[PDB]
């Protein structure tokens, strides 16, 4: 039932802060922790994400993680920073240094003990966990290194529980680092084995959303975090609110993961119109379906038309019908059978949640296990091989304790996963 | 002061505006538009209020 969340690095911490603001707004909780929601259904299932103290104050089940103590102060002093439990802020004196080696092996190792301690405390407070959540970025040092360390430890400690990761995948057009090929290469191979489901977010597509859809002239990381936090909340909409066709994290995982190594999804969310456009846009479920499959609408920087859809998930929110929920998926399958997979007909699952997002009438979140993720994976693999051919930037990792064979194993896993995606993309009945 | 600073001679242009288009050799009077003509040809940029005050006086 309950889900326990963790935030890694500056990116993960800011994304999680925006997500917790969104959840508090949905459940009618002020930053002070007390409740003013006008609906009973919020308190009906407020316990999934929040734990109430003896005095009734609702504290999120969130564990914050960053080697650098910089963003901890920012998130604490933020508008909703008073919500989090003070001892859930675990940080070190020395920064991550933008190095997966010392974020995963030396500096993060001595602090992952306390991280697992607080995670165990949250799990014991919970009746029994529906799953773990981890928001992080693979291009950083602490978001990648100790985040993957936490994923591995939770994999070993809670085998049957779900782990869902929101991983920010770097792109060349957005790249503000030089070692993110190394970091992503050393992180996502761990994510393949230790994560029940992973969900890729690319800042290039996040920025394109404000380029075209929202047409915001100066959109900030706050706006991007709101865009991803809409998803972060909408994934668990059926868990937190009743609906006609309920679902949960394992529901989606079973309907979206045909093979254990293919659990990398690309995300979408399509009540996205600008303030000018919403004046003229006629909101309807058919139009929601039309927007949810648009290439430019997806917040993952890869064109879905270049691959094929293994599986898809449509988490609709808002009290609507069921014909236009499902028959529309039938229409898109029939009219884009080339874009889908023949040996898995009816690739799209749908779920309906009665409660719509605040300020809206209907909404939808899109999960896609398309074969265009291997495009991102092969490009980052090419960048990693180019870096690794001349052994450049490797001496920091080796000095912190990394060895060449682990990089070779990481790139071997890269090629294996890319080939695994390709041999189902080109597979025929 | 501008005149002795820049060696300004409005007499020939004003004389030509007095005798332009006109068979009259000299009338010792000229229009406000042609006075502004002479000032502009001599390149003396003045505010419209100042020009109106000067032509009124």
């Amino acid at each position: 039932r309950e889900i326990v969340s963790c935030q890694a690095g500056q990116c993960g911490n800011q994304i999680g802060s925006k997500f917790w603001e969104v959840i508090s707004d949905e459940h009618g909780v002020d930053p002070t922790g007390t409740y003013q929601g006008d609906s009973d259904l919020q308190l009906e299932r407020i316990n999934v994400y929040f734990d109430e103290s003896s005095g009734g104050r609702y504290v999120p089940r969130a564990v914050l993680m960053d080697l650098e103590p910089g963003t901890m102060d920012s998130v604490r002093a933020g508008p909703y920073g008073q919500l989090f439990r003070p001892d859930n802020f675990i940080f070190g004196q020395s920064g991550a240094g933008n190095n997966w080696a010392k974020g995963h092996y030396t500096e993060g190792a001595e602090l992952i003990d306390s991280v697992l301690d607080v995670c165990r405390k949250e799990a014991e407070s919970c009746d029994c966990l529906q799953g773990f959540q981890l928001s992080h970025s693979l291009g950083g040092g602490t978001g990648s290194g100790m985040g993957t360390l936490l994923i591995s430890k939770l994999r070993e400690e809670y085998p049957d529980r779900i782990m869902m990761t929101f991983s920010v995948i770097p792109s060349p057009r957005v790249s503000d680092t030089v070692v993110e090929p190394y970091n992503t290469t050393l992180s996502v191979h761990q994510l393949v084995e230790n994560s029940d489901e992973s969900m890729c977010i690319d800042n290039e597509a996040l920025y394109d959303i404000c380029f075209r859809t929202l047409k915001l002239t100066t959109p900030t990381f706050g706006d991007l975090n709101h865009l991803v936090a809409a998803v972060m909340s909408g994934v668990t909409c059926c868990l937190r609110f009743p609906g006609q066709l309920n679902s949960d994290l394992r529901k989606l995982a079973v309907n979206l993961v045909p093979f254990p190594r293919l659990h990398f999804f690309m995300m979408g969310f399509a009540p996205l119109t600008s303030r000018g456009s919403q004046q003229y846009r006629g909101l309807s479920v058919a139009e929601l379906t039309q927007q949810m499959f648009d290439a430019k609408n997806m917040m993952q920087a890869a064109d879905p038309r270049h691959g094929r859809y293994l599986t898809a998930s449509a988490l609709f929110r808002g009290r609507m019908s069921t014909k236009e929920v499902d028959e529309q998926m039938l229409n898109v399958q029939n009219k884009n059978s080339s874009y889908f997979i023949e040996w898995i007909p009816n690739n799209i699952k749908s779920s309906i949640c009665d409660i719509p997002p605040k300020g809206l009438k209907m909404s939808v979140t899109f999960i896609g296990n398309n074969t265009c993720i291997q495009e991102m994976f092969r490009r980052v693999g090419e960048q990693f091989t180019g870096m690794f051919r001349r052994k450049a930037f490797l001496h920091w990792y080796t000095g912190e304790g990394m060895d060449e064979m682990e990089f070779t194993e990481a790139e071997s896993n890269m090629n294996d996963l890319v080939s695994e995606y390709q041999q189902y993309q080109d597979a025929t009945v | 002061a501008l005149v002795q600073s820049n060696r300004i001679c409005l007499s020939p242009v004003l004389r030509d505006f007095d005798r332009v288009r006109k068979g009259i050799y000299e009338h010792r009077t000229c229009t406000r538009t042609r006075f502004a003509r002479g000032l502009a040809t001599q390149n003396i940029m003045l505010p419209p209020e100042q020009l109106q005050l000067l032509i009124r006086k």
């Binding site: - | 505006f17 332009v20 288009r21 538009t33 040809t41 020009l51």
Partner: protein, 439 residues
């Protein structure tokens, strides 16, 4: 959105730019300090100045102009003039030494050490711009700077900016009243870029302006200031189609492909009317037909080339004011009926009209009287062969005796390129004759 970059070269270019920019400032309601009145609104469109002025977060409006002269007199006059705060401290390039009516000096000795930073300023302006329509280069080909540095600069722009539109507003030597003796050499040598690297070339010779202002403006003694004011009025009339809204808005390419039939044929006649003074204006019924007739009369031309001596090829009329769409149709119809002018047989239409709702503005104490409507005709015609033959015979009489040739030769230009210019003009004359010849 929809920008255009001005480049002023030489003394003539700099002074024409001064007139054009004071006119643009008072059309867009921008004081010489470079700001807005903030207490009164002129009513001009808010995005109108984007084609000539770039905004600043503090409200400043920086002109999209590059002044480029090899000597500091006029540039320092601009720097210490009324518009000292309007212009950027840069893009106001003053050289250490002029070209001395030597196309060779302006193209080979001191032009090579200045075109690099000129291109740097140009690319800075282009980067600032977002929808750059094209470049407008104002100069006189008869001088040294405007000939040499102008030719080099247009060559570099053509190389590094593809096929972007170029408008070369050039003050050619006039048939009789000419200020320089090596001016024929400068013009004939600088026409290389004008034939090739100039996209539309515009004649603005001085005798036509003098004659027009002699009996139209009711002033006995105008000067270069009045000539530049007329030139700036023409520039504003031409650019208003993209500056402001109108019944038939046109752009640089729009009156490019509609006016240039052949790559070698881009020189175009110019005229503007109703060009009247304060006394003239209040007594003349300046209707659209009347002003169009005055435009097509050969006394009201800003280029000393008799249209009756040649064949009209293609005329585009830019109207400003309250011109109803069929007043221009009536004017064109009566033009076809009246037989004083004649077009070429293979261009039956031969006419363009572009109407703007913005009436022309008058600078204080300026040339034009404040009129409701005006029209400027830009006309490609075969009459330019007359002025080209004039300047070519002028050049041959000097080149036969090899006078003044050593001044060009000694700096490092060869002599055969004088001859090259000679057959370039010969080919221009020949192609004018061929296109004017009936089918």
């Amino acid at each position: 959105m929809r920008e255009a970059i001005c480049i002023h070269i030489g003394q003539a270019g700099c002074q024409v730019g001064n007139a054009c920019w004071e006119l643009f400032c008072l059309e867009h309601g921008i004081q010489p300090d470079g700001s807005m009145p903030s207490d009164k609104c002129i009513g001009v469109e808010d995005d109108a100045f984007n084609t000539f002025f770039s905004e600043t977060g503090a409200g400043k409006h920086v002109p999209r102009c590059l002044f480029l002269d090899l000597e500091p007199t006029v540039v320092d006059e601009v720097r210490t003039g009324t518009y000292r705060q309007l212009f950027n401290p840069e893009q106001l390039v003053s050289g250490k030494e002029d070209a001395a009516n030597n196309y060779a000096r302006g193209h080979y000795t001191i032009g090579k050490e200045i075109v690099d930073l000129a291109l740097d300023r140009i690319r800075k302006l282009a980067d600032n711009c977002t929808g750059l329509q094209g470049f407008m280069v104002f100069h006189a080909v008869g001088g040294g700077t405007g000939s040499g540095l102008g030719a080099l600069l247009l060559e570099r722009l053509s190389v590094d900016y593809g096929k972007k539109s170029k408008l070369g507003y050039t003050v050619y030597p006039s048939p009789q009243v000419s200020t320089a003796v090596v001016e024929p050499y400068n013009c004939v040598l600088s026409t290389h870029s004008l034939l090739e690297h100039t996209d539309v070339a515009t004649m603005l010779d001085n005798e036509a302006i003098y004659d027009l202002t002699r009996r139209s403006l009711d002033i006995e003694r105008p000067s270069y200031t009045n000539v530049n004011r007329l030139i700036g009025q023409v520039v504003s009339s031409l650019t208003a189609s993209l500056r402001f809204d109108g019944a038939l808005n046109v752009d640089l390419t729009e009156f490019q492909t509609n006016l240039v039939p052949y790559p070698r044929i881009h020189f175009v006649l110019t005229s503007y009317a109703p060009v009247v003074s304060a006394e003239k204006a209040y007594h003349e019924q300046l209707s659209v037909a009347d002003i169009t007739n005055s435009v097509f009369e050969p006394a009201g031309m800003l280029t000393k080339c008799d249209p009756r001596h040649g064949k009209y090829m293609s005329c585009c009329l830019m109207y400003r004011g309250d011109v109803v769409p069929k007043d221009v149709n009536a004017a064109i119809a009566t033009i076809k009926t009246k037989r004083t002018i004649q077009f070429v047989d293979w261009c039956p239409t031969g006419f363009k009209c572009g109407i703007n709702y913005q009436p022309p503005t008058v600078v204080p104490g300026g040339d034009l009287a404040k009129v409701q409507r005006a029209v400027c005709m830009i006309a490609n015609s075969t009459a330019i062969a007359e002025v080209f033959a004039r300047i070519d015979h002028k050049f041959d009489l000097m080149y036969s005796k090899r006078a003044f040739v050593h001044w060009y030769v000694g700096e490092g230009m060869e002599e055969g390129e004088f001859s090259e210019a000679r057959e370039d003009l010969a080919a221009l004359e020949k192609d004018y004759e061929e296109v004017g010849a009936e089918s």
